[PDB]
Amino acid sequence: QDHFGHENWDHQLKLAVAWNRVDIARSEIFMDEWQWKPSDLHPTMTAALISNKPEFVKLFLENGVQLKEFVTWDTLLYLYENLDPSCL
Amino acid sequence: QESLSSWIPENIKKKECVYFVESSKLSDAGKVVCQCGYTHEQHLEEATKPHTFQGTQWDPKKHVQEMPTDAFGDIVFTGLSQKVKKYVRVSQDTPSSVIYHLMTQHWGLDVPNLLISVTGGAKNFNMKPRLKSIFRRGLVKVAQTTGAWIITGGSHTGVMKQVGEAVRDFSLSSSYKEGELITIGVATWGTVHRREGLIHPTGSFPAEYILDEDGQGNLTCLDSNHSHFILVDDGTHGQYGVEIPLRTRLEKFISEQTKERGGVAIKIPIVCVVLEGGPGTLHTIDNATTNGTPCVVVEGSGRVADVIAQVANLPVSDITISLIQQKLSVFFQEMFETFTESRIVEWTKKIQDIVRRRQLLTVFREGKDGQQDVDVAILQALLKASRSQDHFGHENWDHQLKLAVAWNRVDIARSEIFMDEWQWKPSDLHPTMTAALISNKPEFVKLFLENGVQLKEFVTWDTLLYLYENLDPSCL
Amino acid sequence: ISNKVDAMVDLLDLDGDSYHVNARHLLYPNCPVTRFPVPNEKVPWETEFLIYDPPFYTAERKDAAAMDPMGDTLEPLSTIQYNVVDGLRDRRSFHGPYTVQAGLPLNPMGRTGLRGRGSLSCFGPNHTLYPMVTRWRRNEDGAICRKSIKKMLEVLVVKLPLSEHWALPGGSREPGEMLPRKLKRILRQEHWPSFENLLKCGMEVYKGYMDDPRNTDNAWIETVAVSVHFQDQNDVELNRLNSNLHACDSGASIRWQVVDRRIPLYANHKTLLQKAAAEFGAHY
Amino acid sequence: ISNKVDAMVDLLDLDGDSY
Numbered sequence: 001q002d003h004f005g006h007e008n009w010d011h012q013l014k015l016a017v018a019w020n021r022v023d024i025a026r027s028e029i030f031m032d033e034w035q036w037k038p039s040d041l042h043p044t045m046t047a048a049l050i051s052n053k054p055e056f057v058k059l060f061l062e063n064g065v066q067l068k069e070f071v072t073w074d075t076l077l078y079l080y081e082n083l084d085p086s087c088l
Numbered sequence: 089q090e091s092l093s094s095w096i097p098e099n100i101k102k103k104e105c106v107y108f109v110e111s112s113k114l115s116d117a118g119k120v121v122c123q124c125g126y127t128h129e130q131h132l133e134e135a136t137k138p139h140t141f142q143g144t145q146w147d148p149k150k151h152v153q154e155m156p157t158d159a160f161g162d163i164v165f166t167g168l169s170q171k172v173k174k175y176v177r178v179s180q181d182t183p184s185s186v187i188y189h190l191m192t193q194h195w196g197l198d199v200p201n202l203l204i205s206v207t208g209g210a211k212n213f214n215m216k217p218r219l220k221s222i223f224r225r226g227l228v229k230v231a232q233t234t235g236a237w238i239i240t241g242g243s244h245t246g247v248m249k250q251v252g253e254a255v256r257d258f259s260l261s262s263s264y265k266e267g268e269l270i271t272i273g274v275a276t277w278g279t280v281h282r283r284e285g286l287i288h289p290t291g292s293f294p295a296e297y298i299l300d301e302d303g304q305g306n307l308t309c310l311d312s313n314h315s316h317f318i319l320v321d322d323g324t325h326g327q328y329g330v331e332i333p334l335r336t337r338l339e340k341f342i343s344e345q346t347k348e349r350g351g352v353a354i355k356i357p358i359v360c361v362v363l364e365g366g367p368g369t370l371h372t373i374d375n376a377t378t379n380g381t382p383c384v385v386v387e388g389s390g391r392v393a394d395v396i397a398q399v400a401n402l403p404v405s406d407i408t409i410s411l412i413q414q415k416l417s418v419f420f421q422e423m424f425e426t427f428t429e430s431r432i433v434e435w436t437k438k439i440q441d442i443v444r445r446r447q448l449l450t451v452f453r454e455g456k457d458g459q460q461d462v463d464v465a466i467l468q469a470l471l472k473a474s475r476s477q478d479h480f481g482h483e484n485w486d487h488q489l490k491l492a493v494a495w496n497r498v499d500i501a502r503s504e505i506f507m508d509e510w511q512w513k514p515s516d517l518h519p520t521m522t523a524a525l526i527s528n529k530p531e532f533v534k535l536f537l538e539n540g541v542q543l544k545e546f547v548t549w550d551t552l553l554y555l556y557e558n559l560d561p562s563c564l
Numbered sequence: 565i566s567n568k569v570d571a572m573v574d575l576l577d578l579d580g581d582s583y584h585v586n587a588r589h590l591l592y593p594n595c596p597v598t599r600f601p602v603p604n605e606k607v608p609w610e611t612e613f614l615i616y617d618p619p620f621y622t623a624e625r626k627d628a629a630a631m632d633p634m635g636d637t638l639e640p641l642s643t644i645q646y647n648v649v650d651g652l653r654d655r656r657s658f659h660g661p662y663t664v665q666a667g668l669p670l671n672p673m674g675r676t677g678l679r680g681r682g683s684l685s686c687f688g689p690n691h692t693l694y695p696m697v698t699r700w701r702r703n704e705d706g707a708i709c710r711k712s713i714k715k716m717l718e719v720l721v722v723k724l725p726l727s728e729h730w731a732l733p734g735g736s737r738e739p740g741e742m743l744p745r746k747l748k749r750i751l752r753q754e755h756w757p758s759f760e761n762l763l764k765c766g767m768e769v770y771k772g773y774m775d776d777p778r779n780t781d782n783a784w785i786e787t788v789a790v791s792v793h794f795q796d797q798n799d800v801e802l803n804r805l806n807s808n809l810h811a812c813d814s815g816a817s818i819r820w821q822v823v824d825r826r827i828p829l830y831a832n833h834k835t836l837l838q839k840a841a842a843e844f845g846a847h848y
Numbered sequence: 849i850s851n852k853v854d855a856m857v858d859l860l861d862l863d864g865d866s867y
Contacts, residue, residue, distance in 0.1 A: 002828045004821065035301050039167070062260065064169065117706055212712070305707035404864040568853055575860055 009034045013044060022055045030063060038065045045070065050082050092194040093161075093291040099186060101154035101179045102277075103323035107146040108136035115326070116305070122151075124324045131323075152323035154179045159277075159287050159319070163295040165312045171259075175286070175295070175317040177277050180330055184341040187318070195316070197270070199347050201495050202236030202470075203356060205339050207372060208247030208363030215389030219454050223386065224254035226462020227361075232258070232268045233463070234495040239339060241331070242273025244301070244311040247363040252313030259313075273314040276330040277321035281309040332372075343381065350523020352490045359383070359470045364390040367435075374438050382448040382473040384466060391419055396439065400451040404444050409436045447476045467500055485510045489520060498531045506539060514541045521546065526558050583607055586775040586831060587676045587784075593683070593777045595621055600677030608674035618781055622681030631685040634668075637782070642667040646688060657689040658771040658786050668782050673773060676781045684783035689773065692787045693743030694734030694833065695764060696840055699794030699802070701822060711847030716822055719837065721829065722751060723817035730821075732833045734787065743788075750814030760808065763801075766792040769839055774832050789836060791843065823848065 001008075009029065016025040041060055048056040108130035111121040122130030130136045131151075143150065159177035164170075174195060178187070191197050204227075214220075231238055238255075241248045255269050277283065281304040286295045299309050306326060310317065322330040343358040361384045362373055370392045377383050387397035395415055399407060409432055416432070417424040427435075442449065450469045453459055474487060485505065492501040517536055524532040581604070588602050597619060606613035620636075627635025632653065634642050644650035646669060647661040655669075656662075662672045669688035684690050701709040701716035709716035722733045735746025744764055745757055752760050769789035776785050794802050811818050821827055823841050825848050827834065841848055 002826045004824070004828055066167075069167070116708070302710060303703060305703070305710070405867075406864070565850060565853065568857065572853075572856060572860060 006034060006036070009036065010040075010044075017044065017048060017053070017056055020053065022059065025056075026059055030059075038063065039069075041065055042070060042075070046075065046078070049079065052084075089293075092190075093293075095194060096160040096176065096190075097156035097158075097289070099190070100157050100160070100176070100182065102157035102159060102177050103148075103152045103154050103179050103321050104133045105131045105148070105151040105323050106134060106137075106153045107139045107141070107151035108132040109138050109142075109144060109146065124151075124327075126323075126325045131325075148323060154181070158289040159283075161286065161288075161292040161295055163286065163292075163297055163317070166296040166298060168299070168312050173315055173317060175319065177319040177321060178334075180320060180322045180334065182334065184334070184337045187338060188341060188345070197237075198235065199345065199356070200235050200237045201347065201356065202231075202234045203339060203342055203358040204231060204236055204238045204466075205335075205358065205360040206238065206240045206247065206251060206363070207360065207365065207369055208250075209365045209369065209391065210241075210243070210246040210248075211364070211366070212245055212249070213364055213389070216454075219386070219388045222454075222459075223462060224251075224257060226465075227251065228254055228258040228269060229461075230463035230466055233497060235268075237342075238269070238271045239274060239335075240271070242275040242310050242314055242317055243279070243308040244299075245308065248273075249311045249313075250363070252311040255315075256313040267315075270316070271314040273310065273317040274331055274335050275308075275310070275317070275319060276328065277319035278325050278327050278330060279307050280319070281307050340379075347494070349494070350526045351519055352494065352523045354487070354490050354494055357470050357474065357491070359466060359473070361385070361466070362393065365392040367392065370435070370438060374442050377442060377445060377448050380448070380473070380477070382450075382469060384450045384469045385452065386454065387452045388454045395419055396442070397451055397453075399439060399443060402443070404440060407436060407440050407443075409433055412436055412439070448473055464500075467497075468504075471500070471504075482510060482512070485512065486516075486520075493520065493524060493529070493532055496529065498535065501532075502535055506535075514539065515545075517541055518546060518551070522551065522554070525555065528560075584671075584673050584676070584775040584779065586777050587671070587673075587779040589777055592621060592678055595623065595682070597621055600675075602675050602677040606675070609670060613675065616675060616677075618675075618677055618679035620680035621678050621780060623683055626681040626683060626685065632681070632687055632783075634687050634782075635681040637668055637681070637687065638666070640667075642687070644687075653686045654691070655686060655688045657773060657784075658691075659689075659773055662688055669784075671773075671779060671781050671784050673784070676779055678780045679782070680780055682780040682783060683778045684780070684785065687783040689784055689786045692734060692737040692785075693747065694732050694787050694789055694836065695744050695747065695766070696732070696769065696789060696791040696836070697794065697805070698791065698840060698844075699820070700797055702797050714845060714847035717841060717844070717846050718820040718822055719840075720818060720820045721827075722811075722815055723819075725816040727816075727830075729830050730828050731830045732836070734833075737788070751811050751818070752808045753810040756808060756810065759804075763792065763804075764790065766790040769836070769843060774835075776832065789839070791840060 013025055013029050016022070016029055038060075041063075042065070045057070045060055045065055048060070104126070105122060105124055108122045108128065110119070110130055111123040111125060115121055115125060118125045120129045122128075122132060122136075124131035126133070128136055139146065139150070141150070157177050157179075161175065162172050163175045164172045176190075192199065230236070238251075240251065243249070244252075251271075255271055258269055259266055281300070282298050285297055286292045297310075299312065301309075320331050320334055324330070339358060342356060344355065346353055346355050348354075359382050360373075360376060362369060363386065365373075373383055373392075385393050385396055387400075388394060390397065398415070412435060413432055416427065416435070450465070450472075452462075452465065458465070471488060471491070474491065475484060477484075489501055489505050492498070492505055514536075517539075518541070521533070521536055521541055524536070583604060584607075588599070588607065590598060590601075592599055599621075600616060600618045602613075602616075605611060606616075622635030625631070627633045630652075632644070634644075644653060644655060646664045647656045649656065657672060659672050662669050664670075681687070697720055699718045701718045703709060720733075721730045724731055733744065733747040733751060735743055735749060737743035738746055741761055741764070742757075745752075745761065748757060748760070767790065769791050771786060771788055773779075773784045773786045779785060794805070796802075823837060823846055825834075825838075827837070829837070838848060
């Protein structure tokens, strides 16, 4: 599908993690030909956590997302808004 | 810290022009250039002057000046990892020795048992998966197990970037001694993208460095996986080739120094492996193999490589320039024709000469035959080379053995050093046995026992006195 | 051990030529009819194709005022000069002298499976103009960007509100030189329109009939491909191109764009751009 | 047993004149 930029990699990835399976993305989404920058995953990482999907977390760690650079204040405030509602 | 911090400017110089007379042709808006255009209305860092000399075409002999460098220190790939890396800017005309000295003393580097100088095509490309896997695997393994330096360019392109990916792969594993794999980058200071970021006297120990793929013109950036980075410079910005005249001087100087552990002492061996490459790579390959320094090539994904992989079997003088013409034509297929007839005969000469030296070279033959593992190949390669070296007696078996045990692995010697054809005498191992013990290497001990060294005949008085002089110093 | 042996189990048990595709495209746009099936073999007139039975398709406004009243051109009204300017319609193709079929043109490329007028106004060819402005892509320091090996160009595209496709600013050549003033009907300016008209003087790329959904076997479409290029990226010509910032009349959006084999654009305009970059050595 | 089965894995996936 036609595009302007590389947010199409964003689209492939948003999908591959929307569906739970990961094998796909680690197989091809992160093969090569994007030369992405780790600061271009934080929206995904966000959704990776809130949904309790550890595998993708390990993944973006292997591709080097920097926690210290990542878990900022506002994002933190965010993650504390969408805890699983059942929890005491 | 401050010792080396002062030492570097006390020792090294960096180049810069003192003749300010504008270039002839203008660059990309770079009309402020005295034929080099680093940063000024001219190629000037001092008073933009003709150096009291209105003498046009003032050569680097009449333009450039070497002076203590404000471009050393420690660095870190900002926004890329947490590890740091050592870097330094170095002039062109510099004694190889002082570099080695900095490397060992001021950088704390142990004299290594092996010196893999890898080369290939600065071009970017790919290869088969299976081949790429076995390659990165064997390379990093053999580089670690013997404690080998690894020397190459440092730009983020080509096979340099490929092996950069390989070493980073291991550091992703990095089971233990993550600092094992040490890799040094040899590039030209003129071709650096954001280089200003470290130009600072008295050390820039925490040195942030941005990077930007494709965010650069002809000048390049660095690969982000090597462990150390030397920068050679001539006093010129948009120019190439300021590296090789030293790289040769350096690696040569290392092929001479000797190591001495246990009781054994040997000279460091040096073998070079090459990848896809091209014409200039062919030039360097021959210019090395005529100096003993042997070579190993991968059979697969190589313009200048696979052609030789093919001609590996053809006997000498059976290589016509027409065979070559169609070969290079079917292989290049983009520059397949731009070759003058006044160079293809040169290439026939070179390739036929190389294949003549039927020992210093080695095919790989990926998968089919003898493709056990990359390491063992390199071992047999360097080994056969050493053996072919001329000698008088059988102390060459001594030399093969002293090596095979200098490097820790034993499989080699038990496989071939003790196969046959020597008919040695067990009383001709005691120097080795000595070094086998002092270094705490039991396997070799079991070995020479299987080949019957007689303890009672061996552990004499003086030797005993010896072994009690070099106990491990830490022991209570 | 278990996971390893399972692998053993698994292994052990396991072991085209240039055609007017947009013209032959079924379901003519907005005409609730279907054109005849015309396979690749029998597409040109010169091929043996007897079953051919194209139905007459003429929109209600195709044969309208100032348009070729040729919607039912079987009449004597189709007496206009073919491959010759019959007054207001220079009914003549850049491709060349187009054959006449009973006072009706035949598509000079092949059969289209659709008879009648369609949506094209005049029969035979229907010329217009699609200009081309090209500028390099510089970095922050002033150097031009690069592809893997090739380089990067920037081309501006005007959005159309109800297009579902970004389109090159090309307009119907209703006037002679003001064809981009049909392209820039509301884009460039009022007077500076004439300025750019002088600036419309450029380098040509390609002319002739191109593929399109709205070609019957009677009326086809050709146009002109001029190429104004921004070699340097700091001149007063470009500053004037910026000074053309009077687009707030009837435009959807306007913006530069880098060449890309998937750049969101009209269908054939992309082929045009591919020709454009081919004329320079850029990437794709 | 482990060292032995690994061998199965490896095998199974592997298969001029005088001038």
